[PDB]
Design an enzyme around this catalytic site. Structure first.
Site, PDB file in Angstrom:
ATOM      1  N   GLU A  11      42.604  58.287  30.191  1.00 39.26           N
ATOM      2  CA  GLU A  11      43.064  59.603  30.544  1.00 39.26           C
ATOM      3  C   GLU A  11      42.892  59.959  32.013  1.00 39.26           C
ATOM      4  O   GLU A  11      43.596  60.830  32.514  1.00 39.26           O
ATOM      5  CB  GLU A  11      42.292  60.628  29.683  1.00 39.26           C
ATOM      6  CG  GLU A  11      42.576  60.461  28.195  1.00 39.26           C
ATOM      7  CD  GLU A  11      43.940  60.858  27.717  1.00 39.26           C
ATOM      8  OE1 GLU A  11      44.729  61.396  28.617  1.00 39.26           O
ATOM      9  OE2 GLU A  11      44.302  60.673  26.601  1.00 39.26           O
ATOM     10  N   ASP A  20      51.028  66.153  31.959  1.00 33.73           N
ATOM     11  CA  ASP A  20      50.765  64.887  31.319  1.00 33.73           C
ATOM     12  C   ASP A  20      52.036  64.022  31.269  1.00 33.73           C
ATOM     13  O   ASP A  20      53.107  64.388  31.766  1.00 33.73           O
ATOM     14  CB  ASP A  20      50.042  65.017  29.984  1.00 33.73           C
ATOM     15  CG  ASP A  20      50.881  65.470  28.799  1.00 33.73           C
ATOM     16  OD1 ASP A  20      52.133  65.608  29.047  1.00 33.73           O
ATOM     17  OD2 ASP A  20      50.441  65.637  27.678  1.00 33.73           O
TER      18      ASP A  20
END
Ligand SMILES: [Cl-]
Ligand SMILES: [Cl-]
EC number: 3.2.1.17
Length: 162
Positions: A11, A20
């Site tokens: 991440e 994202d």
């Protein structure tokens, strides 16, 4: 290696609101804020989540706090899920991490949708499950991360992360 270090590699860490891979507003270590297009709706969620006026930016500590909540919630969700629980219980420690990773990324509902793969993992058919997991939008959309998780299920070691 442990679940935290694994997820931190997948991440990354960002201290300012970002989008994202799906274009959604996120912050920290993969903490989704909102699927809404509005940056304002994101800034609102963020302040609600932190308990202060952040103005789209948080500290390392704050990031790690959200991360601890998120990992806990992923684990608890698996344990509460009728489809996921039996799979988790059947797995070794390393493989358990791989399932937590999928859940953190795609949600309990999403992973629970991988009916066939789940059955194969439960049966310990490593190679077959790996091949089935790759036939998914997930794999086509984030192939490097997917490959890492997939190898983890295949081998039961941390080699993909070393
Ligand atoms: Cl496909
Ligand atoms: Cl990727």
């Amino acid at each position: 290696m442990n679940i935290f270090e694994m997820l931190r590699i997948d991440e990354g860490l960002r201290l300012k609101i970002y989008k994202d891979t799906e274009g959604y507003y996120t912050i920290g270590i993969g903490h989704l804020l909102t699927k809404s297009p509005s940056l304002n709706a994101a800034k609102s969620e963020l302040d609600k989540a932190i308990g202060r006026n952040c103005n789209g930016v948080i500290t390392k500590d704050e990031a790690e706090k959200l991360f601890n909540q998120d990992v806990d919630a992923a684990v608890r969700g698996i344990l509460r899920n009728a489809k996921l629980k039996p799979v988790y219980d059947s797995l070794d420690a390393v493989r358990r991490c791989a399932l937590i990773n999928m859940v953190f990324q795609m949600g309990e509902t999403g992973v629970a949708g991988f009916t066939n793969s789940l059955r194969m993992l439960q049966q310990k058919r490593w190679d077959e499950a790996a091949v089935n997991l790759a036939k998914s939008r997930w794999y086509n959309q984030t192939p490097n991360r997917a490959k890492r998780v997939i190898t983890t299920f295949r081998t039961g070691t941390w080699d993909a992360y070393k």
